[PDB]
């Protein structure tokens, strides 16, 4: 049956894909693996049950663990990367915790491989921390593996997929060569000499009291003072434009915060929590005209909000803004800025050089924007966006920087960009519709111009126009144009439909919703006596909320706002801008953060 899209509705929950926390199948044993979603998520989240920590939602290890404990009744240690469990040399009885010998056997070795033992996949370039499976059968000529984080589809079977078993000249193999562009070869696998595996329809074993998980630490975030003695003079490749640009903008003992891994986990947690709190109630507002209203978005623009709503849930950048304080361990999120990505690049980028210019940068602490690239990668790899794509900005070195830090992302998975200073790229073609010099047809607009400004220029051009207007090549291309024209599958990044999420009519929504949740701070649309209390700011809709208040606190006489970014769907890094009386934008510093990391 019918459709009027005729360029397919993009999304993130892509097809061959069953959503996070879903069950893909069982494991011989009925041990659960769990959707991570696809293979770049994190969760942030632990996963504990009787304060046994199973490992993180739901990546590789922590499947090898709970399944480790479910087959044999051992548990599996603390390990950094899946990598390190074939260097492993003992594991735990889940009651005695005496230890218990383990066996490496080495792939590519005349030992047949055989079911129930740790596969384990090397470090390597793509695939860095490694991989971690279970074998669950081995066949003539192939194996069966059980996991999580490899593969998102439902489980046909009880395992994941079948991996090929090489057999020549009296050596096996393991190969896996399903994606032959990116063949893979395990270390080989670990097996438990003399633990039987538990019958079929045991119950779960209980652990030994000791073996209970750790409270981690506390999360902290330091402002520290530093003694550089190595320093780099001039750092900032001026033949990459982005450096080039914010080198023109601004000019090229020293100050930063240091976090310790618990604070970046929190963060990761709460801003996807946060996420996924946004959208929801974004769902709310769309289908509801009554808030549509509320939030000042003209009737005449429903339909096309709503289509956008409907057709592309896709989207490449956004940004939290949170507060931290020390001693109460307390974030609290006060706005979600998800349709303009400034400091995408100060957080993605210069922050990093900035370290390696002056001997920050270590083994022990990462720079807190590690991840951005990787993942701005990934959300253009799922955008959806195929073909061209048009970057378009104002005349202000800032956005032009930005749109070529997200241009470089783009074409590093496949994509043409065209970075697009004001709209004289632009022509109407003798159909009207919008198209660049090389005669391309306007796809997908990535940009920093703002829908507001955008329903802005449609007015005065209705005006300046007339009604009965219809575009011809002897007509300029206006902002309108672009974003507003009778092409309504040209994707756009960020899409109308972000605008919700940035409106504060949105948070007495999400407090109403989520009132439970730590990061969430009481939002209303009329003043209650809770709040008179409490403290409260008076926030404008263009009437207006009232949003609970949050003691700032100082650090050698600085506050400090911190900013999370969400790229594509995944909590991909924060930065922190700074101030001695009031952070303002541009004008304030932005100070590098540094993650202290896991030395076991
Ligand atoms: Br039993
Ligand atoms: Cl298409
Ligand atoms: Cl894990
Ligand atoms: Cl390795
Ligand atoms: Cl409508
Ligand atoms: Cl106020």
Request: one cysteine or more.
């Amino acid at each position: 049956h019918m459709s009027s899209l005729q360029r397919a509705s993009v999304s993130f929950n892509k097809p061959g894909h069953i959503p996070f926390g879903a069950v893909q199948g069982y494991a011989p044993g009925g041990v659960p693996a769990y959707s991570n979603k696809h293979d770049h998520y994190f969760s942030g989240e632990r996963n504990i049950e009787d304060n046994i920590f199973f490992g993180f939602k739901y990546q590789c290890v922590e499947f090898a663990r709970r399944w480790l404990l479910v087959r044999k009744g051992l548990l599996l240690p603390d390990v950094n990367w899946a990598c390190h469990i074939f260097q492993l040399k003992e594991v735990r009885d889940a009651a005695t915790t005496e230890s218990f010998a383990v066996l490496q056997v080495r792939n590519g070795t005349t030992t047949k491989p055989e079911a129930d033992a740790l596969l384990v996949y090397p470090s390597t370039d793509a695939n860095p921390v490694g991989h971690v499976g279970t074998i669950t059968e081995v066949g003539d000529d192939y194996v069966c593996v059980a996991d999580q984080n490899y593969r998102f589809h439902k489980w046909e079977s009880s395992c994941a997929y079948k991996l090929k078993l090489d057999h020549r000249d009296g050596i096996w193999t393991i190969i896996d060569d399903i994606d032959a562009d990116e063949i893979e070869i395990p270390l080989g696998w670990l097996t438990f000499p003399g633990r039987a595996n538990r019958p079929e329809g045991a119950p779960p074993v209980a652990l030994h009291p000791s073996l209970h998980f750790k409270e981690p630490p506390k999360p902290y975030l330091l402002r520290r003072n530093f003694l550089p003695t190595e320093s780099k003079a001039n750092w900032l490749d001026m033949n990459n434009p982005a450096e080039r640009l914010f080198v023109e903008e601004f000019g090229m003992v020293v100050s930063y915060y240091e976090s310790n891994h618990e604070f970046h986990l929190r963060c990761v947690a709460y801003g996807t929590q946060l996420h996924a709190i946004f959208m929801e109630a974004t769902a709310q507002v769309i289908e509801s005209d009554e808030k549509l209203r509320l939030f000042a978005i003209p009737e005449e623009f429903w339909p096309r909000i709503r289509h956008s709503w409907k057709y592309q849930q896709t989207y490449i950048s956004g940004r939290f803004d949170f507060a931290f304080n020390n001693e109460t361990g307390e974030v609290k999120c006060f706005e979600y800025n998800a349709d303009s990505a400034s400091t995408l690049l100060e957080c993605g980028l210069i922050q990093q050089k900035w370290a390696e210019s002056v001997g920050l940068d270590k083994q022990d602490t990462r720079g807190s924007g590690f991840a951005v690239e990787r993942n701005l990668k990934m959300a253009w790899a799922n955008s959806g966006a195929t073909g061209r794509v048009h970057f378009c900005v104002d005349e202000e070195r800032e956005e032009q920087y930005t749109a070529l830090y997200c241009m470089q992302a783009a074409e590093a998975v496949g994509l043409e960009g065209k970075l697009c200073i004001l709209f004289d790229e632009f022509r109407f073609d003798d159909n009207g519709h919008v198209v660049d010099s090389d005669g391309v047809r306007v796809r997908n607009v990535w940009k920093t111009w703002m829908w507001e400004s955008a329903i802005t220029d449609y007015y005065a051009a209705r005006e300046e126009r007339g009604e009965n207007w219809k575009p011809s090549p002897k007509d300029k291309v206006r902002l309108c144009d672009l974003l507003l024209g009778d092409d309504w599958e040209i994707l756009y990044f960020e899409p109308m439909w972000k605008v919700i999420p940035s409106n504060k009519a949105i948070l007495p929504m999400i407090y109403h919703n989520h009132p439970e949740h730590p990061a969430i701070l009481k939002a209303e649309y009329e003043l209650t006596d809770e709040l008179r209390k409490h403290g409260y700011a008076k926030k404008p809709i263009v009437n207006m909320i009232y949003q609970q208040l949050f003691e700032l606190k100082k650090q050698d006489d600085y506050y400090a706002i911190i900013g999370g970014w969400m790229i594509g769907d995944a909590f991909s890094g924060t930065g922190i801008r700074e101030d001695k009386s009031v952070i303002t934008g541009v004008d304030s510093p932005f100070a590098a953060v540094r993650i202290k990391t896991d030395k076991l």
